[PDB]
Design a protein around this ligand. Sequence first.
Ligand SMILES: CC(C)(COP(=O)(O)OP(=O)(O)OC[C@H]1O[C@@H](n2cnc3c(N)ncnc32)[C@H](O)[C@@H]1OP(=O)(O)O)[C@@H](O)C(=O)NCCC(=O)NCCS
Ligand SMILES: CC(C)(COP(=O)(O)OP(=O)(O)OC[C@H]1O[C@@H](n2cnc3c(N)ncnc32)[C@H](O)[C@@H]1OP(=O)(O)O)[C@@H](O)C(=O)NCCC(=O)NCCS
Ligand SMILES: CN[C@@H]1[C@@H](O)[C@@H](O[C@@H]2[C@@H](O)[C@H](O[C@H]3O[C@H]([C@@H](C)NC)CC[C@H]3N)[C@@H](N)C[C@H]2N)OC[C@]1(C)O
Lengths: 189, 185
Amino acid sequence: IHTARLIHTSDLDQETRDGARRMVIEAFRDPDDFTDDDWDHALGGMHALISHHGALIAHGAVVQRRLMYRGPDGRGHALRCGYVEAVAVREDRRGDGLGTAVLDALEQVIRGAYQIGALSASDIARPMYIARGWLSWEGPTSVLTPTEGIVRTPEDDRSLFVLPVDLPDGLELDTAREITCDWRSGDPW
Amino acid sequence: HTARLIHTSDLDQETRDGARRMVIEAFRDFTDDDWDHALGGMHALISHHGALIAHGAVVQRRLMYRGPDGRGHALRCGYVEAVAVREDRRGDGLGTAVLDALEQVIRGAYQIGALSASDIARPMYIARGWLSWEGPTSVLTPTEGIVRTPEDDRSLFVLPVDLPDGLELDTAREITCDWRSGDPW
Ligand SMILES: CC(C)(COP(=O)(O)OP(=O)(O)OC[C@H]1O[C@@H](n2cnc3c(N)ncnc32)[C@H](O)[C@@H]1OP(=O)(O)O)[C@@H](O)C(=O)NCCC(=O)NCCS
Ligand SMILES: CC(C)(COP(=O)(O)OP(=O)(O)OC[C@H]1O[C@@H](n2cnc3c(N)ncnc32)[C@H](O)[C@@H]1OP(=O)(O)O)[C@@H](O)C(=O)NCCC(=O)NCCS
Ligand SMILES: CN[C@@H]1[C@@H](O)[C@@H](O[C@@H]2[C@@H](O)[C@H](O[C@H]3O[C@H]([C@@H](C)NC)CC[C@H]3N)[C@@H](N)C[C@H]2N)OC[C@]1(C)O
């Protein structure tokens, strides 16, 4: 049985922070890339950590952002989103449920503080999100840019997963419709 | 005089409702959207015997800033919200202890802190290290473009903690926040 500890970015010491960052980059690389924008995107919220003999073996982070969604009534909602980033298990420790343990903890943050969880999954982790009941987003994805308007993001079109936990009053989320993230540098999703 | 720091996700329901009520009572108007804006980040709590007497929150947003090259930056921002102290206990430094714990989150976790405050708190914030934002402000809206936020009596303060790629801020230029319903700032 595995249990990740949850800890805010502000409570991570330099050592653990640099270590987490180096573990996640290693897990994603195979000697597309995990860049410093990808790491920056994982900062600011709650980290889930599992370590062994002082070494991080599993990491995940949930940060706040806004997801824009417009229903068929043409209204418009800016939902408080718990966005999951930098989920990773050290290669040699994979296949034993550490990844499940990270997501268990992050989902606890999502359900307790956000209206919706979302992420853009790597191909190897999609099965994990399906089995946990995340909803694959089927409509076009877009990003709200500063200077153009809402711009389509075709590279992200079949990778988004959502987890509606606390949608306002009577909002029905139609996965067939468009969805739009707020602006950031690097990959918007 | 030391406030404790708890993420929204670990607040039980009584604490949440208590904090919502206490902050409403302090603002004697705090709208329901104003409360939603306080949710999802770290709450600074000071309580006595089960009674919440000071609160504050810092939530994660993005502030857009354009340099002299036109290159744009979407800074990771810790936005201070719903700082309030029980009316009968003001003047004792609780508000300042709440600001202390929240600047700790900002320093540990964000590139920049930001808050909107009246000109009456302007000397304390300047004192505490915060820069007054003299330039224009706006919000990146979903259906229109970047729309100028009209001036009110509150002014915007930023706390440059950890600016990326050695960027230096020119408080005279534009700063625009990300979208949310209710008051964008
Ligand atoms: C994705 C990753 C974190 C998975 O970690 P892991 O510890 O091996 O995962 P777990 O052992 O906890 O597997 C959890 C569940 O995911 C699902 N799963 C993962 N791969 C699966 C597969 N090929 N077939 C079926 N289910 C699969 C399963 O339901 C599994 O439960 P199960 O094995 O009992 O069926 C890991 O491979 C990794 O670090 N990859 C690098 C790429 C990356 O970081 N992606 C981030 C995902 S957004
Ligand atoms: C603003 C507020 C949170 C401060 O709470 P507090 O416990 O009074 O805070 P502190 O004791 O640390 O300081 C109170 C402020 O008033 C000042 N103040 C209060 N009594 C004072 C006195 N007798 N002499 C001088 N200054 C006094 C404090 O020094 C500080 O402002 P200043 O230092 O710039 O003058 C409180 O007034 C409040 O809850 N207001 C209602 C909600 C609100 O307006 N919040 C917005 C915050 S930006
Ligand atoms: C539709 N093609 C996508 C592909 O683009 C790709 O999606 C990536 C997706 O993998 C990527 O996120 C992952 O990878 C990020 C980083 C390591 N770049 C690979 C870190 C966060 C992690 N969730 C997103 N930020 C961008 C998104 N386009 O992988 C899955 C996919 C279904 O094959």
